[PDB]
Paper text:
The spike protomer can be divided into an amino- and carboxy-terminal region designated S1 and S2, respectively. Distinct S1 domains mediate receptor binding, whereas S2 comprises the fusion machinery.
We could also model a major portion of S1B2 (residues 480–575) such that this subdomain—purportedly crucial for protein receptor binding—is now fully resolved in the context of an intact HKU1 spike trimer, our findings essentially confirming the crystal structure of a HKU1-A S1B-C fragment (residues 310–677)24. Of the two observed protein–protein interfaces, the one with S1A buries a larger surface area (1,207 Å2 versus 442 Å2).
Numbering used by the authors:
A (entry chain B): 14 to 376
B (entry chain A): 267 to 748
C (entry chain B), D (entry chain C): 1040 to 1150
E (entry chain C): 819 to 984
F (entry chain B): 765 to 984
Amino acid sequence: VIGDFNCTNFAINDLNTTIPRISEYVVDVSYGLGTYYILDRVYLNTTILFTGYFPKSGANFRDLSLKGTTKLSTLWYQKPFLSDFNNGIFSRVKNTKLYVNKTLYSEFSTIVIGSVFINNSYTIVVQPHNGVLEITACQYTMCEYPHTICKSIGSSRNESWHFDKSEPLCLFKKNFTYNVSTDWLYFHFYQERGTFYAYYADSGMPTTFLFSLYLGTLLSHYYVLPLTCNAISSNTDNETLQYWVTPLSKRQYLLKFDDRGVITNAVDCSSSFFSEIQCKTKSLLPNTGVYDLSGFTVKPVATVHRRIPDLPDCDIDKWLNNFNVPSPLNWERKIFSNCNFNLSTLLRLVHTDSFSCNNFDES
Amino acid sequence: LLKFDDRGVITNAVDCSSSFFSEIQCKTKSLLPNTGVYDLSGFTVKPVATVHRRIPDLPDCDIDKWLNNFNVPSPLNWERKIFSNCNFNLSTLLRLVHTDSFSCNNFDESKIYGSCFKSIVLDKFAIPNSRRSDLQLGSSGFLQSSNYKIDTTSSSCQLYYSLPAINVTINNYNPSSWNRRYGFNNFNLSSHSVVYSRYCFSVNNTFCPCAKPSFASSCKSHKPPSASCPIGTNYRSCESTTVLDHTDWCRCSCLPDPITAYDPRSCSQKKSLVGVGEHCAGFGVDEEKCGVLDGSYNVSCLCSTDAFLGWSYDTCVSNNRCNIFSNFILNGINSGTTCSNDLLQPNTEVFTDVCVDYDLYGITGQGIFKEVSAVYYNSWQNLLYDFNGNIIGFKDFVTNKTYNIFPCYAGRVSAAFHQNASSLALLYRNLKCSYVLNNISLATQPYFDSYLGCVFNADNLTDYSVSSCALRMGSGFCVDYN
Amino acid sequence: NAQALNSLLQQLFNKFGAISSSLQEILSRLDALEAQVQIDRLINGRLTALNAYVSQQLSDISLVKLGAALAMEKVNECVKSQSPRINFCGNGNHILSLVQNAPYGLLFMHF
Amino acid sequence: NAQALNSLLQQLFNKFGAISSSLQEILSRLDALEAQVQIDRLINGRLTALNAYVSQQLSDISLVKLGAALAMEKVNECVKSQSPRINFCGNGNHILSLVQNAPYGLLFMHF
Amino acid sequence: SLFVCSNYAACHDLLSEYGTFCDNINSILDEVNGLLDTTQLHVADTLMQGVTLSSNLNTNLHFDVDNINFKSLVGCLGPHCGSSSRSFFEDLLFDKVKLSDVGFVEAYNNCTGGSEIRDLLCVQSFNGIKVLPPILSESQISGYTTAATVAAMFPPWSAAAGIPFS
Amino acid sequence: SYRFVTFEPFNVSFVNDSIESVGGLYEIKIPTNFTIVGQEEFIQTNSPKVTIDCSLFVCSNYAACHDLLSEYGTFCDNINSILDEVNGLLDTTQLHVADTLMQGVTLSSNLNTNLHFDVDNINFKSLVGCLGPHCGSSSRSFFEDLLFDKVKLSDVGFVEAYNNCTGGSEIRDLLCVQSFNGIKVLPPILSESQISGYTTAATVAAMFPPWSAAAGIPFS
Ligand SMILES: *[C@@H]1O[C@H](CO)[C@@H](O[C@@H]2O[C@H](CO)[C@@H](O[C@@H]3O[C@H](CO)[C@@H](O)[C@H](O)[C@@H]3O)[C@H](O)[C@H]2NC(C)=O)[C@H](O)[C@H]1NC(C)=O
Ligand SMILES: *[C@@H]1O[C@H](CO)[C@@H](O[C@@H]2O[C@H](CO)[C@@H](O)[C@H](O)[C@H]2NC(C)=O)[C@H](O)[C@H]1NC(C)=O
Ligand SMILES: *[C@@H]1O[C@H](CO)[C@@H](O[C@@H]2O[C@H](CO)[C@@H](O)[C@H](O)[C@H]2NC(C)=O)[C@H](O)[C@H]1NC(C)=O
Ligand SMILES: *[C@@H]1O[C@H](CO)[C@@H](O[C@@H]2O[C@H](CO)[C@@H](O)[C@H](O)[C@H]2NC(C)=O)[C@H](O)[C@H]1NC(C)=O
Ligand SMILES: *[C@@H]1O[C@H](CO)[C@@H](O[C@@H]2O[C@H](CO)[C@@H](O)[C@H](O)[C@H]2NC(C)=O)[C@H](O)[C@H]1NC(C)=O
Ligand SMILES: *[C@@H]1O[C@H](CO)[C@@H](O[C@@H]2O[C@H](CO)[C@@H](O)[C@H](O)[C@H]2NC(C)=O)[C@H](O)[C@H]1NC(C)=O
Ligand SMILES: *[C@@H]1O[C@H](CO)[C@@H](O[C@@H]2O[C@H](CO)[C@@H](O)[C@H](O)[C@H]2NC(C)=O)[C@H](O)[C@H]1NC(C)=O
Ligand SMILES: *[C@@H]1O[C@H](CO)[C@@H](O[C@@H]2O[C@H](CO)[C@@H](O)[C@H](O)[C@H]2NC(C)=O)[C@H](O)[C@H]1NC(C)=O
Ligand SMILES: *[C@@H]1O[C@H](CO)[C@@H](O[C@@H]2O[C@H](CO)[C@@H](O)[C@H](O)[C@H]2NC(C)=O)[C@H](O)[C@H]1NC(C)=O
Ligand SMILES: *[C@@H]1O[C@H](CO)[C@@H](O[C@@H]2O[C@H](CO)[C@@H](O)[C@H](O)[C@H]2NC(C)=O)[C@H](O)[C@H]1NC(C)=O
Ligand SMILES: *[C@@H]1O[C@H](CO)[C@@H](O)[C@H](O)[C@H]1NC(C)=O
Ligand SMILES: *[C@@H]1O[C@H](CO)[C@@H](O)[C@H](O)[C@H]1NC(C)=O
Ligand SMILES: *[C@@H]1O[C@H](CO)[C@@H](O)[C@H](O)[C@H]1NC(C)=O
Ligand SMILES: *[C@@H]1O[C@H](CO)[C@@H](O)[C@H](O)[C@H]1NC(C)=O
Ligand SMILES: *[C@@H]1O[C@H](CO)[C@@H](O)[C@H](O)[C@H]1NC(C)=O
Ligand SMILES: *[C@@H]1O[C@H](CO)[C@@H](O)[C@H](O)[C@H]1NC(C)=O
Ligand SMILES: *[C@@H]1O[C@H](CO)[C@@H](O)[C@H](O)[C@H]1NC(C)=O
Ligand SMILES: *[C@@H]1O[C@H](CO)[C@@H](O)[C@H](O)[C@H]1NC(C)=O
Ligand SMILES: *[C@@H]1O[C@H](CO)[C@@H](O)[C@H](O)[C@H]1NC(C)=O
Ligand SMILES: *[C@@H]1O[C@H](CO)[C@@H](O)[C@H](O)[C@H]1NC(C)=O
Ligand SMILES: *[C@@H]1O[C@H](CO)[C@@H](O)[C@H](O)[C@H]1NC(C)=O
């Protein structure tokens, strides 16, 4: 369950229909996947080392594109489908084309991003409408079991993923268009210091800037909503849905630019030894030679923590809060040894005002 | 450069900056240097004009109209307004508000006038008098550790001012959806009472601050209050045992409060810090003190107002003027559409093929412009950079014309000196005499063009052969004296 | 030589712990009080780079002088005459040699 | 060579004006604000030590190359043949020489 | 990345400003080692310029002609000159000092599993300072010197101007 | 793919012959047919002469930087002095090489070098420059043309590159940026045309009488 509002209970099965499948797909950054354009930079025919929020090469994608016809299972609204949004995600979406009455119809999944998913915390919603990308972020009163339908062919149910009879007061609401006759779309979503960022690309694998919204809080979980259409899963001869998501990380990338300013290649710079050789050489095809690679300290396998057994309490609070406070002419002194103390409790119980140190720190 | 004789009387003096010969004398620390070739630096070509480019008329920012608003909030919920695509006067803004102090870190006062920024981020909250000293940089006080963290690695400006005590309302509203979910209403505090949080706690999405009613029915000694939180939430970790004098004693987690819990590891709510650009995570609710006694799957989970704790409040009044904090966050330095107009300068069209200083929308420096026609700039792409952080061309905002920025000439000048001659035999290497004449300096001495460059104060007679020259300039050319 | 000059040129874009590798940004962001420590860091780093470069240049030029002395002996003993030294001019039974000019050196063709 | 490596190893335990010569104590006593200046002092001192070491290594390897060229001429002119150079191979009236392998060099036994 | 900053993230992040110094240091050491390798190759090549050996050379039995003993100077006496061509004379030289290239290899080999802590080579190797073996092993150079000596010995007397040694 | 093998760069040449004196006689391979082969060798005599100044490199045109550099001015004086003595040593070495190219050289005045160039059936036309009496402009030989066209960054190349720096439309060149940042490669005190003329004179004196460089005897 993703919300707390009970909208409806039609066509639901919960009799342990346990067939969840998460597909995998290796991440190939070596042609421009997961790379975005800098906001005001043009580089021509050069190779630049750049650090940014990037997907990790050699990892795996994750196909969260659910698909249903009538039934809504209860296993579609828990982990691992209700996934983890810790720093940010990079998305790769298939653009499903439906040919109804010799007319193109593009439709794919709807992604929601939030923290708690109730109507006192904001929720970023991205939802297409036949080539128009609606990106809104308000306090949506989303249902316990969300739902998305197919505009080209109506399914057995109506669309029901929020109960906002009146538009809630909020911050961001905008419309975006794109080339509706495309095959794959790429999305960068990440957050940094309380501001939510978003990058977009439709034609070409490198990504460009879209917008940036400030929220004031953090994002915790994202979820790809299930879609219900009838012309898609018709005897599995037609097309399907592919929504591939990978987590983001702050790692150095090596990028290559051509004469037009388009990113042609990318290197992870930390995936393997070969990538590290490429990033040290600042090229993609280094000359024949022997290279020495450092950073080869063996990782520890365990931790040992030794303390002397149970020692009496120091009672620093009981001496500091004594009722006989002396003058600076005769300052007192009490030496503490062979005793354990809690610094947080000691700071809390006495009515402190300031506590600073020199040549040493608090942490 | 001064010379003293045996009596201590100054006999000679050198200007050290009048001419090349004086510079040779001052480098040599003598008046009659030996015969040789000297290289003299400090030969960057002076700019001949200035080009200053600004975006045309943008609306006023009205920073004064937002700073002097009559609804000042708490450090628990600090407001923020982002300013872009607007022009501002810093002097008028500082003057009209009743400022007291305005200091900055990693950036100064004098470089704000006539400068461009991508955006200006401003945060505002009232200062309680008890925690006034908490706002100093690097101090880990209750304001800096639970309400508002000040970044120290970013170019920021801190502003202190005050509004008159009347016409002031205090907006108290905690931005914690977790606290609002389990029954937290508005505050009950007097006017000019500024509330600040002392500890912030973060929980997971599946939190539920109530006990299981089925387990609550079995608990007969110290039975906790029970309710019914919505689905997807795991209940409390209350478990029953025997304390060797009671048949059934059941204890719960976070006894008695998350602040003073003897076992914080098993407690779900954890004490947390706050990052820059983020609010307080929440208020640690007392688990046992809140709830409904004997609630069996019929009452949703709510908690009392007094259950939430870990905050104290004070007042803003100091000599009938409530002091207000402000924090300027300047990002995108020397680039962007938000420029200051205190150093007012009319817009100047871009010149071509002349060494001029430029102020192209915040980017400063000097260079030579050569206009070309290249269309690799997209809608967002607007500046062309070298492979390591160097501007090598841009595209104008208004005229959409592609330009290139080339560096100005910064060569050196040679000087051939002989002891018997009081003059110099100069040599500007790899140059032509026409470029030296009109673009560098006029010739008061006979100049000629040679293979190595343009030679000054030495006639061109490269037909004779000399088998011994003490003044060699290279490639078989020597400058003797006669 | 081109690589050495390129490395010395790339030494100009090192931060050395300062806020910016370029003096223009420092002088346009700081005013003569905290600017001075950044400028001192840049100056100390660039002076260290220059001292390392001139030491390496001294070693390289000493090696060049030694090779040129070898070339002078090679001209004296193999081209203008034939000293009875086995395998000094060329590998195998030497006959004579001829000298031709080369970019930064000479070219010997041992027959 | 052992003394040079030992000196370079002992360079790692110099305070250079910092509170501790080891990075573990500094990173366990300071938190990224006053730690940075101490780590900068340690880095600058160790980089100066490395630059001095590589300059001395360059000079030593140049001397080794010159000695090896002398060894090549000694092999060419004293072992395989006998050039008429007085007191080049050995002191006194020379007869012949033989070459044997040695650790980091050759061994010439002049007779 | 081992000497200046061993395994600490803050030190490695602060070292990124001075990364050009590290690239220069590694490049200088690389060209120094390349010069050393070229010099070793030139010495090995000039050890054999006009050398010429005979196939019918069973060096285990004909080793002392003209009443002169070169058994100690000539290695791999016989037809098994594939394993170790080191001569008896070089045995004293290579046993008087133990820290040769083979000594360095055997010392760095005995570094992972051991009960001794006062050795300096293991500490140096763990702190990024390591002495790599040369591109030619001393067994090959010993075989080269043996080949030169035998060429001076027997017909055709390549290293002795085509004439009997006596 | 990657094969890990042994590295044996040098080995002896074997000859199937007896190693014993039968009948008082040994066995050896006397050559019966011969040829003349050649081999080239390049020895580096000169190096580029680089000059670096603080008042452009460390501090380009900024008053505060130049004022702060006054404390460390002794370092800049030492750097300039060290580079000056390095370039002086290079110039002295070049002069010594040019002098030792012609020690006892002696040419004939009646030497019209364009028509009499190959006597005794040996061609020196490619090795001898300025064929004729016009040896004032360029004495570079035909043999040196391949050498000086294979590499373009000679001293003449540096001069032509620094010349084409003030007026142009190209920005990716490194030499202009280096020269504007105070790093510049000055031409040597002797041009390579003069050294080519010296080598040509040495070769001709080795060939034609009086045979100064060939010990007073015909070359064949
Ligand atoms: C913000 O979200 C909360 C949480 O969902 C909303 O409160 C919930 O509102 C619904 C209907 O508005 C309530 O459902 C009702 O339940 C009674 C029980 O007898 C039933 O008879 C009604 O027909 C209806 O289904 C629900 O109880 C209530 N509380 C919870 C915990 O879900 C709230 O309305 C939202 N606010 C806005 C402005 O949308
Ligand atoms: C883009 O950069 C490449 C690489 O520097 C350029 O290719 C070089 O072109 C020059 C022509 O002057 C050749 O001498 C080099 O050998 C080329 N190098 C490689 C690796 O190909 C290419 O010319 C540049 N393109 C443009 C339009 O300037
Ligand atoms: C963004 O574009 C979409 C599609 O054109 C808009 O959705 C329609 O809005 C109209 C009202 O303007 C409604 O009558 C339709 O029912 C909507 N269509 C669907 C499929 O919901 C949307 O309103 C636009 N958003 C904004 C902010 O202009
Ligand atoms: C202060 O800002 C204003 C606009 O925000 C600048 O523009 C002047 O505005 C006044 C009225 O607000 C007009 O009467 C003037 O004609 C405007 N132009 C000029 C050139 O004064 C104003 O210049 C700014 N102040 C300063 C000192 O630059
Ligand atoms: C410079 O380029 C910008 C970016 O395209 C132009 O801004 C828009 O251009 C489109 C088509 O070129 C017009 O339809 C829009 O009306 C323009 N926007 C506005 C607000 O006018 C801009 O017009 C270009 N400048 C010119 C052509 O002088
Ligand atoms: C430069 O000055 C020197 C020093 O006076 C000149 O050398 C003198 O010349 C005069 C006149 O010929 C003689 O009487 C002196 O005996 C010379 N002194 C020495 C120490 O040589 C020199 O002639 C001047 N001119 C040049 C071209 O060097
Ligand atoms: C400095 O040099 C530049 C070019 O090297 C000169 O610019 C051109 O000068 C010619 C000669 O009068 C004019 O016909 C052109 O119109 C000029 N071009 C431009 C773009 O202005 C420049 O005149 C020289 N400086 C001076 C003072 O003469
Ligand atoms: C510098 O002087 C030389 C020597 O006279 C000049 O070279 C002569 O130039 C004229 C005119 O082009 C030619 O007819 C002669 O044949 C050249 N003689 C030689 C020996 O080269 C040279 O032109 C002069 N340079 C300047 C700028 O006046
Ligand atoms: C002359 O030839 C005779 C061959 O008979 C050599 O005599 C042999 O010398 C070897 C020493 O290498 C001894 O081991 C043999 O026992 C000798 N055999 C006989 C039959 O005497 C003799 O050495 C040769 N002369 C010289 C000066 O070497
Ligand atoms: C001996 O002298 C004769 C002179 O007649 C040489 O013959 C000439 O050789 C040149 C080669 O440089 C040819 O170009 C001529 O055509 C030859 N002339 C005749 C008449 O044969 C001959 O080359 C000399 N001998 C040697 C070995 O050089
Ligand atoms: C949710 O609502 C549906 C109709 O909208 C209703 O049939 C169902 O009983 C509700 N679920 C509850 C009350 O748990
Ligand atoms: C969709 O809404 C219509 C509106 O009348 C309703 O008749 C229909 O039953 C709904 N579909 C469902 C609940 O699946
Ligand atoms: C949309 O993408 C398709 C993909 O092949 C392309 O052919 C088409 O030209 C694109 N549309 C536009 C308007 O560029
Ligand atoms: C403050 O409020 C009083 C009373 O409402 C009013 O007279 C006065 O003008 C107000 N001051 C300002 C600055 O608005
Ligand atoms: C809030 O404060 C006012 C004034 O002190 C008081 O009259 C009122 O009862 C308080 N509200 C509650 C719920 O106690
Ligand atoms: C909270 O969730 C995190 C994962 O986001 C998990 O690692 C942790 O154990 C959870 N803690 C509690 C008390 O549920
Ligand atoms: C380690 O093993 C090597 C053999 O490879 C041996 O020479 C050496 O002495 C051993 N080290 C010790 C301390 O015994
Ligand atoms: C010996 O060297 C020659 C030439 O380098 C080579 O052709 C031959 O194969 C070598 N013999 C070996 C490696 O046994
Ligand atoms: C040398 O030649 C002889 C005569 O043909 C032959 O008997 C002998 O086997 C050869 N030895 C070799 C090829 O090693
Ligand atoms: C020597 O070789 C040449 C060609 O290589 C040939 O013409 C000539 O007849 C040969 N002479 C002998 C004696 O073999
Ligand atoms: C500049 O002119 C010189 C002739 O002095 C020429 O060799 C060079 O190629 C030119 N440069 C360019 C980029 O054309």
